[PDB]
Design a protein around this ligand. Sequence first.
Ligand SMILES: N[C@@H](CCC(=O)O)C(=O)O
Ligand SMILES: N[C@@H](CCC(=O)O)C(=O)O
Ligand SMILES: [Zn+2]
Ligand SMILES: [Zn+2]
Ligand SMILES: [Zn+2]
Lengths: 260, 260
Amino acid sequence: ANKTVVVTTILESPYVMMKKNHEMLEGNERYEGYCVDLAAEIAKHCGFKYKLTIVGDGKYGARDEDTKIWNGMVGELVYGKADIAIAPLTITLVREEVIDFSKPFMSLGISIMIKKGTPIESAEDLSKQTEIAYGTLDDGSTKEFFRRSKIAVFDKMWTYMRSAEPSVFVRTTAEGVARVRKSKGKYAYLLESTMNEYIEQRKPCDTMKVGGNLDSKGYGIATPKGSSLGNAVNLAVLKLNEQGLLDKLKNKWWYDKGEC
Amino acid sequence: ANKTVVVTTILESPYVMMKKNHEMLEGNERYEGYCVDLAAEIAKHCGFKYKLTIVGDGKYGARDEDTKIWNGMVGELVYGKADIAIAPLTITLVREEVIDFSKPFMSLGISIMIKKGTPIESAEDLSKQTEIAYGTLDDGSTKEFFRRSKIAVFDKMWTYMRSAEPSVFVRTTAEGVARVRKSKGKYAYLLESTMNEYIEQRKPCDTMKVGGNLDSKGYGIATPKGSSLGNAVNLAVLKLNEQGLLDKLKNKWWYDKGEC
Ligand SMILES: N[C@@H](CCC(=O)O)C(=O)O
Ligand SMILES: N[C@@H](CCC(=O)O)C(=O)O
Ligand SMILES: [Zn+2]
Ligand SMILES: [Zn+2]
Ligand SMILES: [Zn+2]
C-alpha cells in the first residue's frame, strides 16, 4: 500500500528556499530550489508521492559523543521521523555507517570565503596568522573534516578553531556569510565550494572564493539503512546525471539568476 | 574460509603499468601505479589477500547488442571470473544495474585533448567544423555518453563520429594519444579529464586539455552484484578519501612525476 514519502530537507540557498509569495501557498508549493526540483524528478522516476518537511533542529547531522544520539537530518532518518533526505548532505564515513547514500548528485569540496580585499589566498595563509579569525558550520561535515584530519595544516587550523574564543563556529551558513560581510575582513569562513560559489554571485557581491578546494567529495540522497527506496533512488540519481538534468539544475540556480 | 581475492584491472597509465623490471619480479610486484597502490590499501583495510590480473580483452566493459554479453572488466565480474575491479572504471547507470560500485574514489569528466596549436577550445568548436577529426575510446563510457546524449552539440558530434570513415574510435587510450600526436593537429581526442591531465604532463609535452569538462562523474571500485565484499570496500574508500590518501596518490602519479 503506497504511502506518501516524508522528505526531510533544510533551508539552505539555493537548494531549498521559501518562495517570495510562500505565505499564500501550501504544502510543497511553498518551496523552490535545486533540491526542490531534484525531489520532484526523483519522485517522478521512482513513482512516489511526497511531502517536503524542514528538519526540526535546522541541522545537517552529527552524533552526540556522550549520548550517541544523532541530530539533524541524519537523526530524522535514523529514528524513523523521515523516509528520505534530499538536501546538500555530504556523504561521509560516519554517516554511511548509520544511513544509506545514493551515488553523489553533486561534487564539491571545502573552500574559503573571504570579504573582498582580505589578504588571504589559501588555508596555509590562514594558519600562518592570527589577525583574521576563521571558522565553520556546526554539526556539519566541514567541522568533522578538520576534527578527523591528520594533515599538518588542517590540524593546526582545527587546534585554533576548536579553542578559539569568541566561538568561530556558526549555526547556519547564512550566519557565517553575514559574519564575513560585517567583519571588515577580519573573519574568513570555511564552507563547501557549492555554497561559496553561489554566494559569490549574490549581491552585494562583496565576497569571493579563494584557493583550491581542500578536499573532493559529494552530496548524496540519504535513506534509512536497508530502506526499500534506496535502490530506486540510487538508479534515479545516475539517470538524472546522465541525462544532463543535474547539470541543467546547477546552472539554473547558480548562474542563470546570478546578480553580480 | 578466507580465499585470495581475484582483482581485475586494466593496463592504463598511470593507474596500472608494468614495472621496468617486471620480468625479474613476481605476482602483484610486477605492477605499479595509482590503482596498484590503491588496491594494496583497500586490501589492508578490508583484511583480504589478493591477486592482480589484467583483464583478458583489455576493455572496460560494455554489453554487446546482439549476444547481450558483457565484455571487459564488467564482464569478468558479471560472469564470476573476478571478485573485484580496481581500475578507472566509470560509475554508470547501465553498469550499476548489473554490478555494484563503491562511492567514487576519483572525480572526473569528459574532456578534449588537442595537439598544441590546434584551433579548438570547446566541444562546440569541434561540432562547428570538419577539418579536424575527433573520436573517443571504443567500448567505453565516453562513447556511450555521446551515443545517448540529447544535447544538441553532443548529438551533432555523435552523428559525425558514428559515421566517420576511417573510424575515429580507438582501442586504447595510448592509441588515441598517439593519433593526436601524429596528426599535425587534424585529430582531437575526447577522453576523461583524469587521463587528459596525466598525458599533459608527459613528454614530449605536445598535448593540451582545452575547454571545460562536458560532464561530471566518478570512478568506483566494482564488485559482483550482492557481493559481501561491497560494504567493506565502500567504507574503505570513504575512509581513505577522508584521510587524504586518494589526493596524495593522485599527486604522486600525476604531478610529482610530471615530465613537463
Ligand atoms: N553539507 C554539509 C553541511 C555544510 C558544511 O558542513 O559545510 C553536511 O552535510 O554536513
Ligand atoms: N573510464 C571509462 C573508459 C575511458 C573512456 O571511456 O574515456 C570506462 O569506464 O568506460
Ligand atoms: Zn526526468
Ligand atoms: Zn550532549
Ligand atoms: Zn591505510
